[PDB]
Amino acid sequence: LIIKHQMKLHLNELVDWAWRNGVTSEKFHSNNGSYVIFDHSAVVETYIINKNDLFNVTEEIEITLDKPIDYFLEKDMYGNYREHFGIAINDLLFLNTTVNIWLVNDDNSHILIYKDGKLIDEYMYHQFEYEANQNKHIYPNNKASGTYPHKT
Amino acid sequence: LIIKHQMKLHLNELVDWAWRNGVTSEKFHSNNGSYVIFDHSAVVETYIINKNDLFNVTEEIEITLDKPIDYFLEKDMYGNYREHFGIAINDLLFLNTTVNIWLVNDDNSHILIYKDGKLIDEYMYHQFEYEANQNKHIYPNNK
Amino acid sequence: LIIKHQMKLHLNELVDWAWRNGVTSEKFHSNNGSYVIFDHSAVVETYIINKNDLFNVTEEIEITLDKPIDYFLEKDMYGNYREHFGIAINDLLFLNTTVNIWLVNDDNSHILIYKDGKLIDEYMYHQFEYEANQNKHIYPNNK
Amino acid sequence: LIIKHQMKLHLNELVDWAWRNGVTSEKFHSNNGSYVIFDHSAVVETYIINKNDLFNVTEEIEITLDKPIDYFLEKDMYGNYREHFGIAINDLLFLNTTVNIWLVNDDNSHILIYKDGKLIDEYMYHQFEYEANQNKHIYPNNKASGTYPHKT
Amino acid sequence: RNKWHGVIASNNSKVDFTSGNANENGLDGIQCTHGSTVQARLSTTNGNKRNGVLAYAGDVYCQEINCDGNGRRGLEATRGGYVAAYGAKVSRSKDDNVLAYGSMISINEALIERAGRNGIEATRGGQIFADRITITGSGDFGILAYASKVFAEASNISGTKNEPVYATRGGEVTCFGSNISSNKTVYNVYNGSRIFTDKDHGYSTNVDPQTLSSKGLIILG
């Protein structure tokens, strides 16, 4: 169960993500045409990069029982709701009692991943990911934060 | 606020749902190619509808603080989760500390409807950006 | 009251800090000789900045009873120690028995800011000396 | 981890420090020119020594896990703060839980000595010693407490 | 960051820019020239040294194009161009926000703010469409006309410096249900130019309400 996740990151977030998920050599372009070049997992050359510049990066999050999940919500068969941070699903002491497990997406939106004793397949997960936060209005805000740097 | 949920119902559940939420004339299909036809809210034709056949139906639910909700889940600021049945959102005794409210969708799915004192449509979900104006600066060129 | 703290930040932390506390034009160096340059609050140049590279940056924090503090620690007269986040010193409910207040500096370091009812700059830290005037006495000489 | 500590002591404090940290033979000069001579760890000859006379002495305080520390503050991993007087760091029953240990300097100023399971090196300790009490204003008070003793 | 335009379509060519970015360029962010049409449904064209989008005798089609900080007219059409943008969000243009230059522009429900000059303008013929367009913080005028007609069945002009709506050398301003808010004279007419509006809100008028003159006629009814 591997899920593509495309996001836009500032320079600090992009550098952090690149160093955590090792990149040997790659050039990342930004919203405003600035670029940063990683060579041998070390920053080498950066163009004129202003604040609020957005870089597009796609990361794969894979949801499996054995690997840890950053934030999930578990419902016992008795009716108790608990939340667990950064532990695998199998790491629960008594997985026998657990009925449902929902991933949490930092938007306070729950996506069902574990029901009826088995993981949710990829396509039902896509359906639930669309379905969880339908009426999510994002604030519209645009600032150019740049101008053609050279004298032309 | 309109919430759209897709569900899978057998023939009996499909018939009950269709007659409960009036449908005049339309054809429902299933996985195995079997179909049922409603015409003027009457089951005119069925075509080899075995058991364990799942008809996929989309359902529209209007969500409003005054209107009661069949089954929802509320989360306070501290972390306590509770579930309520047949109670309007405004009816809750303690809305002061209620941070989030999801709607349990009978599939064990969860749909956010209430976030930080407002319905989810009214909330605006501010992004993040460092505060700064345009650079508007001339830089040397390396060419 | 101005508190100066020196810290070591990686590239991502350095960029976040520099853009958060606006820097117009200046060059930061690291341990391994790598450097980054901000010019008009833009990252113009970087020179081979590997991971686990520590840029040393000094930071100035203004401390005042009205201004809130990110993370501080308070010690009463009896001996109980507590920690508070995001609360101004004047905001504390029990300042009557609060004897000392240090500022936890995210490095687990501790900087004294409040001592015995006053900010640390206002306190005077009297030394010790036996009370007596000048001797002004003529003594015999051994020569 | 040996730290030099220069201080000014009155006659009583100087005598006490000398006898605790055995001095076989040495002459200590004061602020106002008076001197005290120790010979065979016994006071022999003292010039005209007035009250409030200050003698300069440097003592080495060494911070190690095995030797006792006069006053330190310990933070458990759970979040409890405790203070211990005159015991070594290793003398704690469960050093496993301890996260941070700060020395206390009688000015209510804490200096970090133990973090991340290891002692703080000498240079970081010097940095923290400078850093702990920056805005420490000492009361300015000057009294001569003397005059050229002889008739001249 | 290109020296010339960001994306250019010339000589009867089609280009699609559904959500792309044309920023920081040394000239017009998007330019159609001589019959070519680009499509920019949700693009972002901000910060350029020149116009956010230009239509040099070509068609431009947008839905919610974003513009900001461009060096000149945020949206511009000339020599027969046609810029259609139902919900364009232009802002902070050094010059005019959107200017029609002898051609047509269709911003039905655009929201445009903080222009360095006139909020909208139709100079030297041409027409500009509007349904509920929102002007805010204009430089000189919220609406301007030079022998050109501007239709705004409703509007929310505010924060304008000199005058909310201005008509000169002919040309109508069919701003009927506008929620204008400014201290100066609201409706202005000069050199035989008409204006049509409602009487529900009493707004200052340069000329007597519903009579002809040397200056154009107004119908406050």
Numbering used by the authors:
A (entry chain L), D (entry chain L): 1 to 152
B (entry chain K), C (entry chain K): 1 to 143
E (entry chain D): 389 to 609
Copy out sentences from the published article reporting this entry, exactly as the authors wrote them.
Staphylococcal picoviruses are a group of strictly lytic, short-tailed bacteriophages with compact genomes that are attractive candidates for therapeutic use. Here, we report the structure of the complete virion of S. epidermidis–infecting phage Andhra, determined using high-resolution cryo–electron microscopy, allowing atomic modeling of 11 capsid and tail proteins. The head has icosahedral symmetry, with the tail attached to a portal structure located at 1 of the 12 fivefold vertices.
The Andhra portal consists of 12 copies of PP (gp17), arranged in a 150-Å-wide ring with C12 symmetry, with a 30-Å-wide central hole. The PP monomer consists of three domains: the wing (51 to 160 and 258 to 334), the stem (6 to 50, 161 to 186, and 234 to 257), and the clip (residues 187 to 233). The wing domain resides inside the capsid where it interacts with the portal-proximal core protein (gp20) and the DNA, while the clip domain connects with the tail stem protein (gp16). The true start for gp6 is thus most likely at nucleotide 1887 (TTG). gp6 forms six asymmetric dimers that bridge the RBP trimers and the tail stem protein (gp16).
